[PDB]
């Protein structure tokens, strides 16, 4: 019936396990595309796994570092870690590469890309709210925390590369923001303004509309450069 009331259901969909799985699948597919990633999975499987955990848990790691909490606090969520580990294992080692083939099938891939954005927006909003809880007027801390929750491993890409034995210092995601990093920055500003009560919208409505924006943008981009 009511929109802000469908918005409430949208903004509270349980992200574990299905939306988290989609987030992991899309993120580990991106890892498998990186130069040298398949050979690394064969010669250095622990590091390859460590790399997938970053792609999977980089948002949490970086937010925890910014706020002074254990950077591996999120790895206490055993079920999530094991689910991400299963995704890594299936994408790199499934017989016949069958799992890769199924999740890369473009209609399926686009649904996972859409689901990944649901998770990303929830993470941005959670970062703003968690920072606000610790710093009620900490606008810059709220923005920084929402930003790294959204952007994830991209903001640590120089060190994800280092882990892989790669060093490209000429560029980084702050000096040259990719679209998801820039979108996450706009998103964190919006959620911080909503948290400040200067943006006159319900949090659920902001989640709904910003998620739809990210879904449309990301699905379009995936479908176009396929």
């Amino acid at each position: 019936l009511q929109l802000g009331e469908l918005a409430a259901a949208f903004a509270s969909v349980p992200v574990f396990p299905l939306f988290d799985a989609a987030y992991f699948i899309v993120s580990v597919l991106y890892l498998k595309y990186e130069p040298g990633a398949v050979e690394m999975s064969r010669k250095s499987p622990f590091a390859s796994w460590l790399c997938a955990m970053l792609h999977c848990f980089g948002s949490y790691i970086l937010a925890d570092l910014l706020l002074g909490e254990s950077p591996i606090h999120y790895f206490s969520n055993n079920s999530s870690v094991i689910l991400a580990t299963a995704v890594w294992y299936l994408i790199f080692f499934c017989p016949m590469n069958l799992f890769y083939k199924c999740v890369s099938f473009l209609p399926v891939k686009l649904i996972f890309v859409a689901m990944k954005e649901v998770v990303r927006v929830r993470k941005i909003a959670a970062g703003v709210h968690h920072a606000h809880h610790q710093y009620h007027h900490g606008w810059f801390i709220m923005m920084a925390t929402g930003w790294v929750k959204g952007s994830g491993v991209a903001l640590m890409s120089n060190f994800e590369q280092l882990l892989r034995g790669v060093w490209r210092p000429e560029t980084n995601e702050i000096l040259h923001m990719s679209f998801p990093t820039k979108a996450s920055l706009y998103g964190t500003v919006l959620f911080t303004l909503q948290q400040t009560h200067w943006l006159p919208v319900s949090e659920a409505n902001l989640v709904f509309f910003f998620t739809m924006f990210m879904i449309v943008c990301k699905v379009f981009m995936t479908a176009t450069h396929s």
Copy 2:
């Protein structure tokens, strides 16, 4: 009348906003002199701003990292962040470059350099005292914390460079300490000895004399290689 009583007034001058402004002006001028900095402000203004915040808040960031606190805790001081942001904006984007011209005028520049040293010494002493509060006999933690409060962004210079897309690993400020880094190390030893009660001087008198030493050294150096 009494010196240790003028020393008390000296050591308690309110550093916000005027001495902090001078600290920011001198530090962002240094940023503007770094290779590529003006072009970065035009092509990557967020990163340029991020870079100025490091120059501005590197002391706090590093001390917080050493002590296990949020490395962005200091960014909860909204007024300070906004003041530093105004300084960055004026130095890089003022029409006619007028702000740069005024603050670079050598007599004005030297006064800001003097004021910057007032802030630096207060920060060193505060780092020793804050570490002492957490570790009453933690001599090495007191020295480490006073040192990074004094030295600031210089000790993270390899990563300030990385942010700018620059990587010079051959050298760093520990392997080859510049004068302010070395002076900050001597300063942190003195304040730690004062805190230990092995150096028989009042804290205010130590602040006065060490600040005068840094002012004389820094103003001489600025005026000479102008």
Copy 3:
């Protein structure tokens, strides 16, 4: 009489000062062998000392970083820091290089290598137990913490190099684990399984047998490539 009762004495030998000294001696000998280390001790003695502290306190530094504690918390143990500092000073600056000559004498060196492994295993077990205390079911945090307590400075080797002015990003200890790093990973899994109560052995017996394994392996390796 009883083995698990000799195991109790073995697992509770006071590591300070003698086993810690051996740990420091072996670790700083390794530092002195690294390219450029002697010249660095003459031209950059503070950084050389800073480097020895990493070799000495890297386990604690990294575990503290992983758990969100002060990375220099361990430097509050003044006696340990001063003992490590004496070892650094004697190894690099003793007249006639006499201390180096004595501790490098192969029978003496092998005893110190054995003693170093006693300390390493105790550190792994302590890391698992300390992580368990904070996260009763935090299996991945327990493994990560035991691993860096065992592996020590090796896992930060890229940044130990950076401190020395060296940058080799092609390789790292996760992508290509050395034997002690890999052994520490196996060790942390065993202690975590013991902590979980899935490995039916007393903690003291596990300490005894895993320490004997590391002693045999490390003494063999030192004696062979001497």
